[PDB]
């Protein structure tokens, strides 16, 4: 189970930040779940293997490259030389993301999302997961700091004794 939270700016309302979380079992090829929330209401949708394969075939290009672009777009993996635009319509509950390129837009993906019946649970779960992430990473950082300090001390002592060994 892997999850990734990202911040995006919808073109419909380019003044507030919307947060999209992608959750996939093992790898993005099998499928994933997209949950997009703005702090008040959340929309949840699912993409399975069949739709990704169908879109790749319609994309007229290899599956691997399609999944790479999907990961680069949704999973915040965008580099310097790439711009993506996300469009969301609430009346129809239709999402779709494209790649702007010198006044040339590619329709990379088009998903359908269904409004959840309880946004509080999902928002609480998101913030809870992130808090657990920080709590667990802090322990790793402090343990690594301790180990590095110990190693530095031991290295200094061994070199100091090596000086005397050589001198004798």
């Amino acid at each position: 189970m892997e999850r990734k939270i990202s911040r995006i700016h919808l073109v419909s309302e380019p003044s507030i930040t919307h947060f999209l979380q992608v959750s996939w079992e093992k790898t993005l090829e099998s499928g994933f779940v997209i949950t997009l929330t703005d702090g008040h209401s959340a929309w949840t949708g699912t993409v399975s293997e069949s739709e990704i394969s169908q879109e790749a075939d319609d994309m007229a290009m290899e599956k691997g490259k399609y999944v790479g672009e999907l990961r680069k777009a949704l999973l915040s993996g965008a580099g310097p030389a790439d711009v993506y635009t996300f469009n969301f319509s609430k009346e129809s509950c239709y999402f779709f993301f494209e790649k702007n390129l010198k006044d040339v837009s590619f329709r990379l993906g088009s998903f359908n999302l269904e409004k959840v019946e309880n946004p509080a649970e999902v928002i609480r779960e998101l913030i809870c997961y992130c808090l657990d992430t920080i709590a667990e990473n802090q322990a790793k950082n402090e343990h690594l700091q301790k180990e590095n300090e110990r190693l530095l001390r031991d290295w200094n002592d061994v070199q100091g004794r090596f000086e005397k060994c050589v001198s004798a």
Binding site: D154, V158, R161, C165, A168
Partner: protein
């Protein structure tokens, strides 16, 4: 047969030249060389030298998770540097816990002190239990500190 003479004393340069005269000699074995060195030190009273004072003592360490098993090396600890320094100062580091072992070094791990004590009791000859701090505190003094304070 070499440059050294009988009726005239020798100097540093003369001995260096005589030594350079010899070609090589590798007909001995570690045990014979160690015994010869110890005999020479005892005969000529050279035990006061800063080094070679650990020669007469065989040292074993708790660097194996299980005693008398070479497949569980604990490399990556201060015990390695302690063992190596001891060997540098003339100590005979033994990797097998034989009956002739006279010194054993134990670190912060006291879990297997009971096993060491039982083995010492079983053996006809008893080896004093020592800690890694004793050698660290003795090296700066360049002398064998009493083991009563570090048993």
């Amino acid at each position: 047969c070499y440059g050294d003479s009988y009726f005239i004393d020798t100097d540093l340069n003369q001995l260096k030249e005589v030594f350079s005269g010899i070609k090589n000699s590798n007909e001995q074995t570690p045990e014979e060389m160690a015994s010869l060195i110890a005999d020479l030190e005892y005969r000529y009273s050279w035990d006061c030298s800063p080094l070679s004072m650990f020669r007469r003592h065989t040292v074993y360490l708790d660097s194996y998770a299980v005693i008398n098993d070479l497949s569980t090396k604990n490399e990556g600890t201060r015990l390695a540097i302690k063992a190596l320094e001891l060997r540098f100062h003339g100590a005979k580091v033994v990797s097998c816990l034989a009956e002739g072992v006279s010194h054993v070094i134990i670190g912060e791990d006291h879990s297997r002190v009971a096993d060491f004590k039982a083995f010492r009791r079983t053996f006809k000859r008893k080896f004093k239990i020592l800690k890694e701090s004793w050698v660290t505190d003795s090296i700066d003094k360049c002398e064998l500190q009493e083991e009563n304070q570090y048993l």
